[PDB]
Amino acid sequence: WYPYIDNGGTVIGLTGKDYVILAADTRLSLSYSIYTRFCPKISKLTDKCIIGSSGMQSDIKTLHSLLQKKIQLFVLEHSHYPDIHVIARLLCVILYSRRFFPYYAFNILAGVDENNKGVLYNYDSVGSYCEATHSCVGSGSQLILPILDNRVEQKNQLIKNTNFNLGDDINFVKDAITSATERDIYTGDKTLIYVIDKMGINVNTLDLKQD
Amino acid sequence: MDTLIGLRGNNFVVLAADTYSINSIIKLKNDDNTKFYDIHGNKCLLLGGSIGDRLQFGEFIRKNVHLYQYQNNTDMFVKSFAFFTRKNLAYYLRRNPFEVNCLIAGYDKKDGYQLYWCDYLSNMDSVNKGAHGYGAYLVSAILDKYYHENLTVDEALDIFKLCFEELKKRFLLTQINYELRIMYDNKVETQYVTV
Amino acid sequence: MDTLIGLRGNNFVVLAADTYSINSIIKLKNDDNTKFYDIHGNKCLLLGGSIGDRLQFGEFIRKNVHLYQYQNNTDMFVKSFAFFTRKNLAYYLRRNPFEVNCLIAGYDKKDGYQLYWCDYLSNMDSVNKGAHGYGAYLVSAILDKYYHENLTVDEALDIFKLCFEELKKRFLLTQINYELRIMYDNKVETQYVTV
Amino acid sequence: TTIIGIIYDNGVMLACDSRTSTFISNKCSRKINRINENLYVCRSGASAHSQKIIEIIKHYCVSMKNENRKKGRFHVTKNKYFYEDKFNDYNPLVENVAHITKKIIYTNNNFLSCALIFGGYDKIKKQQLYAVNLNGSIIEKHDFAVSGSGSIYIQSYLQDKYKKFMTKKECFNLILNCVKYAMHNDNSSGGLIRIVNITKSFVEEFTVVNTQMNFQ
Amino acid sequence: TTIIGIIYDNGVMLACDSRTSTFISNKCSRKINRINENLYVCRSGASAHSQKIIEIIKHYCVSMKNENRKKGRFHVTKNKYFYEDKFNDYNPLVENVAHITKKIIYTNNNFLSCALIFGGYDKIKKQQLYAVNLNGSIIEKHDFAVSGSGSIYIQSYLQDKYKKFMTKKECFNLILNCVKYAMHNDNSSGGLIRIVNITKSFVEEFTVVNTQMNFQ
Amino acid sequence: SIYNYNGGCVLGMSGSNCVAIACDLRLGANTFTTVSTKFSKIFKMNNNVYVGLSGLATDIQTLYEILRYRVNLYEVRQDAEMDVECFANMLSSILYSNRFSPYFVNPIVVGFKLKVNYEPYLTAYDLIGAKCETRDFVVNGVTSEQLFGMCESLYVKDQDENGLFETISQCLLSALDRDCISGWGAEVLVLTPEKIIKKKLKARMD
Amino acid sequence: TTICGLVCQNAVILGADTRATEGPIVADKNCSKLHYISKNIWCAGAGVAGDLEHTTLWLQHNVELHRLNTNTQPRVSMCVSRLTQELFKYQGYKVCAIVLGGVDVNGPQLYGIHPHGSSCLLPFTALGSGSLNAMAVLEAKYRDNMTIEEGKNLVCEAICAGIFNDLGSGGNVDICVITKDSYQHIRPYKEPPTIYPKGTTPILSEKIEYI
Amino acid sequence: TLGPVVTGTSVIAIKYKHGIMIAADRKASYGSYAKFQNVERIFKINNKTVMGFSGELADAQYLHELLTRKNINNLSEKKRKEDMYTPQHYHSYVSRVFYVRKNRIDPLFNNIIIAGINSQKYDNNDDNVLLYTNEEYKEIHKDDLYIGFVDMHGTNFCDDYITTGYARYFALTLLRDHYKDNMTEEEARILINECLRILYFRDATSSNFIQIVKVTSKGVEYEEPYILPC
Amino acid sequence: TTTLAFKFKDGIIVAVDSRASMGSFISSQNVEKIIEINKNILGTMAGGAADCLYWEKYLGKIIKIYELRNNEKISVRAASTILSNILYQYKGYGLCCGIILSGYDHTGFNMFYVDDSGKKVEGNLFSCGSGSTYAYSILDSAYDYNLNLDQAVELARNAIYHATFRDGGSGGKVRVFHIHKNGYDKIIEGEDVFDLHYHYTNPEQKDQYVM
Ligand SMILES: Cc1ccc(-c2csc(CNC(=O)[C@H]3CCCN(C(=O)COCCF)C3)n2)cn1
Prior knowledge:
The structure is cut from a larger assembly and holds nine protein chains of seven kinds. By secondary structure, chain B is α+β, with helices and mostly antiparallel strands. Chain B has one domain (2-195): Glutamine Phosphoribosylpyrophosphate, subunit 1, domain 1 (4-Layer Sandwich), CATH 3.60.20.10. Chain B contains four helices and twelve strands. Chain B has helices at 51-71, 78-93, 136-145, 153-169, and strands at residues 4-8, 13-18, 21-23, 26-29, 36-39, 43-47, 102-108, 112-118, 124-127, 129-132, 177-184, 187-194. Chain B is globular. The two termini of chain B are 18 Å apart. Chain F has one domain (8-202): Aminohydrolase, N-terminal nucleophile (Ntn) domain (Glutamine Phosphoribosylpyrophosphate, subunit 1, domain 1). Chain F contains four helices and twelve strands, in the order ββββββααββββααββ. The longest helix of chain F has 22 residues, at 57-78. By secondary structure, chain H is α+β, with helices and mostly antiparallel strands. In chain H, strands 1, 4, 5, 6, 7, 8, 9 and 10 form an eight-stranded antiparallel β-sheet that branches. In chain H, strands 2, 3, 11, 12, 13 and 14 form a six-stranded antiparallel β-sheet that branches. Chains in contact: A-F, A-G, A-H, A-I, B-C, B-F, B-I, C-I, D-E, D-G, D-H, E-H, F-G, F-I, G-H, G-I. The F-G interface holds F 47, 92-93, 95-96, 99-100, 124, 126, 128-132, 134-135, 144-145, 148, 153-156, 159, 162-163, 165-167, 169-170, 173, 193-202 and G 20, 22, 25-28, 30-31, 48-51, 53-54, 93-94, 193-198, 200-211. Strand 12 (195-201) of chain F pairs antiparallel with strand 13 (203-210) of chain G. Bound molecules: ligand A1AE6. Chains B, C: One of its GO terms (cellular component) is cytosol. Chains B, C: Keywords: Cytoplasm, Hydrolase, Nucleus, Proteasome. Chains B, C: InterPro entries: Ntn_hydrolases_N, Proteasome_alpha, Proteasome_beta2, Proteasome_bsu_CS, Proteasome_sua/b. Chains B, C: Component of the proteasome complex.
């Protein structure tokens, strides 16, 4: 009996000067069939930090519940909310604790740190991670990461436009998730977009194709 | 395990190979003579891999090319020779494959000095500097760093000495004997470099 | 790939090993320091195998023997040392075993100069001349032909030079650097032989 | 699949279910195939293997029937056909067809997994049942033949209720009850029941819809 | 092996063959084991596994029966035995024993391949039949239970001949004919037939020598 | 894993009276050692028919030789150029003739159907000839997922030759920069009914 | 993929979706799966795309050759016979699950052909990954005598069920109505950016050739 | 449990105007052998929670015993009707069981549907709970109805209607095509019966002997098992 | 990954690339592979990124506790032994770590190579990763102990460039640190190798470079 299934779906993260966007679909599927058209992938950790994972849904949900448990215990013990960097090291350790029977869940930890700058950490199953200005996990990650590299980096364009705003980034993320839905069978249905800035977290919904 | 090196310039082309016949954990010889296959007309086929396959494939190619050059009374072009060799390697690839790595070198009036890199799977391409065998992993970069298109043959040989030194020091098999073909000035010269 | 050689006479014992530390197809070092383990009391453990296993087993044995020699305030006999080492290798033979080949050498007033040959399976025996590694297949016979019980140390070193020459010429790995321990006349000497 | 054949006083009755394949790819399949006007065969095993075997055997039967013709002159939904050949002059023998089928299946039995039940009537030995088994072994039955994953459940049942010289009506009842019990117990069998009755002069095909009521 | 259990008014009847193992290692093996004076069980599957399971369950049944005893006072070869307990005061319930058997078999169902049929009688549920299946799933039958490689052939047969309230005589005939047909068709079953009849007040044990005659 | 030995990627796109075919220039070995950087995967069959072959390098060369043989024979026997659609069908049949021992190649055919009207023609294949005709773009090679993302997000319909060049070059470069075993230079060919523009892009060599 | 077919009064209605997938990735958004065998015979396929396409071309051209030689309207029986012989000649390989519909002298005949060479005469069938959903719709709503319009509506609803419940199915809905006299192939029966600055991409060299 | 031996086939559950309606055929199989045809594959957990299973029968029975113990413990520590565990509680418990078994590579070979009513605000049945003996239906909002799916890997979620096994293909298509909010009992029965007819026709492991269970303002009602009309 | 370290007149030069990839897909090109163990010892990351990161941070923890306990700075030999001993306790579990611990202690400048197999090779020139062979070749061809800081930095940069150029799994940015008696300095925080190719091998930049 193989203990791993991949429930599909995509999470896209993108940081700005003082804001971070995490947009994830909600379809839950097995093989070629759909368990459901709405299973949220993004969990709130604290008012300035969220986590969105793709992989096997049960592992993702248990990992998110364990993170929330440990963060609340941290608050009750040390009497202050952890930073996104503290949460990032904590999640790295939690993941490596199962190094030999790993969670099948690639993760993106998004948030706004004390210095009010967008922070995006991307993780693989066994704990290896790095900070990033744009990330994507899930079935559509290989489709979407080049789009983010062509828009946010412009390494291969001499004429470069750099002034980005929150609205432009939100529309860009909507276009990226639309393309992922267009080309990835495991991506589709409603997508939730979380925007974290000084005022906190704002959640919006967008409808995607249903096929 | 058979280290082959090839370098091509504007006015030369140099092939090189360690001189070892191996049988199990024993050097049958330190003066191998089954890697280089001179082909009349300033052509050379440098072969790697198991000795029997080297002999069979090299002799097949050499006699076919000489048959062509005698029947037609003309010298086969180096590009035609290289692509004929790649064709013959690919034909056997799925029937009776010779596990042999190939460096086809030669000088021609049509295309100048030419060096072709081909692997046992028949993936062939024209190159300016190439390597075969585990030793490739320790010599290719050197060839990349110290190469320029206008090298003199002597500078090329000094680069080859650098490669041999790195193969003696860092390569697991402390290869010390090498044989070099140096096509240039309308002449093919054989050299033996120890250490 | 770790060639070990041991020779025992009436008035000496010589250990020898190539000084290569390897990692994949590259020599990490041409002067290793992880094969010989000098043990206070004119004892020496020459280990071959994998560097990690060599380090772990050799240091475990060395610290246990030194702990014994400090707690009891006495020098462990070479036979006791060798059989303790074989016992410890056999204990782990069936649980995370160390794949290490061992030559144990020493001198005592009770049994004189002593050489012991032990394989990774922990098959151990006292010998007059022994080898480990693929190089054994090319040196053992030499040791058999040129050995007599009354050899002087210098003759033993000339035999070792013969062995190193055959390892350079016929062994596929052209090993050229060797380190030698010479226990005789109450003193333990370290020698480095190139080529 | 469940295929059964029973010999009664004046004929032979073949019966089969119709379910094909835990997904029912076809719930109305033709397992009883009409090789000749007087000779039918029931299929079981691999559907492709059995269907190609039937095609080959129909080709051979056409050849045999054509060659036999001597020169000169001489002398519950039902469908009933009479034999065009009144005296069985050129209709190939049931045994001949069954044995050539056995030959074909045995020659290629390294990968042909097909079990067949031949029912028929010729003037030599009257009505006939043959069982061509999995690995290519033909056995001539004189009372009844069964095959398929569903016919194992009825074996004892059938053996209890069979009599030597059934009437047409009671033979029909027995074969229908056999197929119904086999369908009830076997998950791999089901659907409408197809029955063929072969006699001296005519063949009639019945189709039966069914339901198993028992207050055990 | 063939093990069957039928329920008639005023009792239950277990029956089994006695063949063990293409070599008949033991041609007379006791499959119906007496767990308690009012509670018997039929074994099938691995002989060692079932035998050890029966030993464990007998141990537990002895424990339960002893612990049940309240304080104070109150108020064709056959062998018949009345119950020592006239009112089922301390005799453990059939369901309890069957379910603890299911628990044991399920806990160790990675390697225990044992199929059991419990027949019994207690004052709560009268006569009971329980079937403990391969992985440790218990199903309470109210008409009959079957198991073994030989009981597949009789399924339809049994289903046709069972009646809701059979008499002792006709139930005995039915179960005997079932076992005989099963042994006739199944190569892995044979030998003398062992039947146990459990009732309100007594248990009978019959041994039957057999032969299957038919003119089909 | 066979396709990982050499890597490589080919990308076709269409605009208004123009069609672009681009490829990477790497020839690798054992999936990580870059042995050549001039290994072009685009071959010209005729002025109106180009093919891009990705996959095993030996299979690419063999298939190119076979295609050239067949096309030259057809054209000489007809005294006219092969039609692009006919070439696509022939390539499909050649691929499928080796269904069970195939050439490990994922070709794309690009060109113009002549009607004069020059309608862009694009089509992609798998190794056994299963072909998909597409109206905007076609991708083959190891970088297929990244290329599909690029042509999904960035494709604009009916672009002139400069717009098409910019879009296709950007798509190819951005896709390649996320691929380990494909890259080391990029070749781009823009055909218009009158001329061809061949450019080598300034790409990463990682 | 989702292909279906059914027999209505004096006609056969085939339907199919328009998606091809290179595994998780949508490789084609408007693929055509209804294949013309002859004027009165059409087929749809699921499985190895090359196998389906080339087997269909072979069958089409052989049927045209037979029609030319015998001057007789092709027969669905002949098509299924040739297809079964070809599929059986290969011991299972060359996987092609085919819905073959037509109208001949014997009325409207629909066949389902298994990759191993088995055929089945059917009133309605579905094949592909979304086959079970199409079968659900057909079973639920199919009836013996239906008009061409009713058959088209049923086919469209079944294909839409497959599209919106199977991850391997999507795109448009192609349908074809074949009658003894002609066919109509409704290809789109139902249908449920950045411009870079000129000169932004650097080059190393440029060559201009005029044809 | 290396694999399934005695298997139960599809289970369907939906929300209708008056509560939860869960259907399952009463058949168990032994491979292709329809060995048992009167099996109870829907289990009542408590007055407001019921359980349906597909797959191995032994594992389903073990899980049912676990949930029975949990219900008895809850009743033992219960003081007011709000202390009774809700269907969501039992769904989370079953999910945790399946996850912990997934981490031990000893899974239960089942797909589980835990359905019921989450609110004590629509009745007073749990003020005096009766375990051994059994007005009009009160309209229940669809938010107060819970239907949760769990699979072998622990994939847990909830929806307005859930299906298991072959129903996830055949029945689910009809449910998504036709299901609507605030359905009457008549309509719910019609829809479920159409789904079960399709399953009977296309699922070799399905039976036409059905069991319908309703969880409503008046507790859990087990209907009379019936053969499918036509 | 391609990491290297070499000992020279003025201390130690450590150089790395910054690419992390998952098979053939480049997941990141901004990875920090030179991890600070303590103020004087640096380590590199080759192989399993999660394993190397977690175990090097764990070694840092052990070292910090040791320094607090004994009021002394640990030596490179001791830390390398601790790491090798810990990595050996996990022999057979599939840890893939190639690390070079280079630092300065009371015994001078030290450099050790430790891999997951338990190796503890001490030397003065090491390289790890898929591009280690090219780095060794370039370094050996031009290594001199009396190189000036600038010359050593140029040599390290060129070696890293060539490794990234010939190796698929290496690339991104070159980072070069200098370890001296009073810590370490980021001589090159990060330099994209795209510029290095057109500085070293193809400076004229008028045609494609031919290998
Ligand atoms: C050191 C380091 C560097 C990068 C990352 C990292 C983690 S994520 C990411 C950016 N994204 C990807 O690399 C995707 C590439 C394809 C495979 N990916 C999947 O998510 C597919 O798996 C589905 C369920 F998990 C990830 N970089 C982690 N540490």
